[PDB]
Amino acid sequence: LCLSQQFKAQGDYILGGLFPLGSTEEATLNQRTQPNSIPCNRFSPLGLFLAMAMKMAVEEINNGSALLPGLRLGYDLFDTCSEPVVTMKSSLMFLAKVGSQSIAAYCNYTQYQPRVLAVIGPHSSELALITGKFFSFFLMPQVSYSASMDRLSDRETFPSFFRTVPSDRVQLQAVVTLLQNFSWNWVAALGSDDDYGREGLSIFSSLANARGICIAHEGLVPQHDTSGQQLGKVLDVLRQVNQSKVQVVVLFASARAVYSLFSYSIHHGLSPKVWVASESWLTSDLVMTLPNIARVGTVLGFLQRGALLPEFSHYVETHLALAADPAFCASQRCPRCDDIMLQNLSSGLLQNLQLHHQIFATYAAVYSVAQALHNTLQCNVSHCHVSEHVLPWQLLENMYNMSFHARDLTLQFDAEGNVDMEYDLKMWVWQSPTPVLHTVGTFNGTLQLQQSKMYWPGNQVPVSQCSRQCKDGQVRRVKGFHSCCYDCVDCKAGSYRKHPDDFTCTPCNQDQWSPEKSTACLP
């Protein structure tokens, strides 16, 4: 097929692109001894679909005249191979000098001409960090789909990183707003022991402390189960939940860990709880396949509301049909992409047309870069100030205060590089013969929520309180991972409250007595 040949196109300005077009054959994941090149022949459809989205966006920009009238926009796409070494190899070629095979070392780098205008960023957060530290020394704009870690928000270390997906902090803010709205003050936090849960747990704990929600305990859970020791630690965590008397659990964990937890919970029952889901978990059927899941108690979470791109399906099918035409070769940038005849795709993900959100995000990233260039050239309806060739650090100024139209949505990067985008609140319906997700609210910075659609399991709202003040008659004990809570003990008859700020119920003298919950010791 003629497919890999389609991934580069000429233009006055060229967008670079990093995509997961494939990965290295699995046995290759072993230590390098000599700096040879790495094979990456394990083709993947996900990267193909995302690259097709980028190509569609650029072709639309070339067809129309709402942006960049009379001049040509191109692209040049490389595979990340999900591999840091290959990613760095590809990333360097973007910054290499124009039409040249080398890159040069200079002190202050606002003096230089790379061979691309901007880079549409990599898929995974690890590569996003690795490349963002690199590109931002050159101050080349990087617009990333699918990278949601909050580390990349920092303008000091990632001054040129942009993304068309919300950071995890927005989702966790929605979570904390929900907890406040239902007055669930005493909660347990769980996250997968991979880096995603690490970041999520840190952010959630800090926000909860700031907003006055007390975390009972903060447990990492195994990303996958392979050993009796991991089963041991997860069972220990689950019994620790019960010991805390918590009723609401925030489970910001990748789907595999949650599937493990609920496998055990179904096997030995535990007890019903309220679970607030990571969006990455809530999306998946895997957990919901477990038998008689209604035993678990209500599952809730927030879901991103992306726009439609119906024309994309026919675009992909058209270009695949063209790639199958041997005469279309007259119309090299991927390994084995050219071997993929249409059965491999039509038997699978093509019938699905959360991948949708990433397709839209890639489209919007291309449109954002095009709008930024349209601004920098200060184009009229039919004219542009093209007298000088733009440099990447010049776009960077315009991108912080523009707004761009992603085919129906109006989007703009905030002061630290994130799009402002709203969420749905969804709850699993279990009254039907099968689990169904239903929408019961929205978060657009404020939690607009519809109480009448909340089918709670006991037909009554769950509660999880802790005391943050104690009465005159009760003595304090502290609890919580940050000493956020108290609970109050009734100081018994024959003992008395020494003073209202003390931590010890005090026995009354041997010749004296006191009532129940007494403040005094009496003759």
């Binding site: 994941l29 072993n30 230590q31 390098r32 001894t33 000599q34 700096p35 040879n36 090149s37 840091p84 070494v85 760095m88 190899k89 360097l92 070629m93 290499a96 095979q101 080398s102 890159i103 040069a104 070392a105 200079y106 002190c107 202050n108 780098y109 690795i130 530290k133 690199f134 020394f137 270390t157 690490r198 840190s202 800090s206 009972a216 305990h217 990492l220 620790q240 010991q243 805390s244 004990r477 502290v478 609890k479 919580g480 991972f481 940050h482 000493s483 931590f503």
Partner: protein
Amino acid sequence: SDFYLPGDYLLGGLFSLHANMCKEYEVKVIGYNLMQAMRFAVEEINNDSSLLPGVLLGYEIVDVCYISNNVQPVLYFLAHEDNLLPIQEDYSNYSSRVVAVIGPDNSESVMTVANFLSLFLLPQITYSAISDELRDKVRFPALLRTTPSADHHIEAMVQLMLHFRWNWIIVLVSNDTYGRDNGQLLGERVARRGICIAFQETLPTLQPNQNMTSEERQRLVTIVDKLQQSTARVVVVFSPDLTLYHFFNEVLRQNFTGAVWIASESWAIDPVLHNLTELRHLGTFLGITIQSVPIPGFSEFRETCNQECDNCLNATLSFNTILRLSGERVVYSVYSAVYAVAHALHSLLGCDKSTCTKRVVYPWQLLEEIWKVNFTLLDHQIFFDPQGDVALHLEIVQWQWDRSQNPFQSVASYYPLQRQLKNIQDISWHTINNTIPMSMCSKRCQSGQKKKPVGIHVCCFECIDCLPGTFLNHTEDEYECQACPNNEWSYQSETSCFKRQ
């Protein structure tokens, strides 16, 4: 100038001279100390006729402002001597400006550099980065260390706490990667060994001479209030030295006293914090650090962008006495790293101890050799584990304030190959009669008196008498009272039954 020295083969050196363009930040004395350590090591190797006969060893050193200015030094080191860096499929025949890099001082800079040099397999040795993630040699094939990792530091802390039976501790962490990582790691280690963390707090990131705002000040007030209320008198701090300047002054403002402070290496031997005389009244300070190795004659030696420092010499001269009385602890790692590179190069040239043949060195071959070195440097052998670490000893140090003698007295020694704390000596406590201070959630119960838990912490329990007719077989369960045989009875407070109707 100090930052450059020509030779046949050049070592790249990365150090953080300035705290917090990179000239304008304040100078940190420790970084200048380490830079002088590297310079002295190269001086010795050039004077010595044994190790590299007839071959000049040069160096080229660049400043790294913590997480800033990490890309440019790497690009400079990798260039092909004309400032151009070619892009290729395979680099086996490439010749960079430097043959090896004595890598940065902190984990994040180390990883940033490693993700770059991993492409070229140019060997990187870091002297003070302790993160355990660096052991992944699929992720970091070119990375080695002359220092133990955070695993062993936390193990040393745990064994210190177990020796004195400190069940009940407070953990304070900075609001950044280092504190977060080490706090979670200590959480892992503590739970399985019978110790309980009362509470954990993230300290605010405050610049030492910045005017602190009301919100930050009330945050600190809240933290010190929590410290003052809690019965846990042992505190572990995972933070850079820069942020503790405000924290300890707030602790002083609240008239807090009587704790034991356990210092992570990031500040355990900082001379600047040590010079705050008012800390003497807070309690006992203990810290985890690398062993002392007296480098013979290094003290006498201690007397294109980002390769300059004006303030360095003037700033160092005042601390010279303190650094001289100290034990040259972290200096040894840099010295040993330079000597490791030197021995590996000596072997790579196939050099006899008469003269070496001079030939092009492709860095991946030098990396090949570095894995195999095994030699005695001053007394200790230095060789690399399969995971790239060198098994140097750690020590637990107590701060002393008689300026006429050593400021950091060694009170215990830790062996990473035995994974054991050893040779504990006399700590001089803050207590009224030098009795070992302790921190326990609840007192030991009497005989005939069962336990009953108060909450999540296993360490906390009530003591409850077994009712008459029941007894407490502590060997089976301390939390339950067993019923006496029908021919026996039990009193209010006794361990086992006696014959009675």
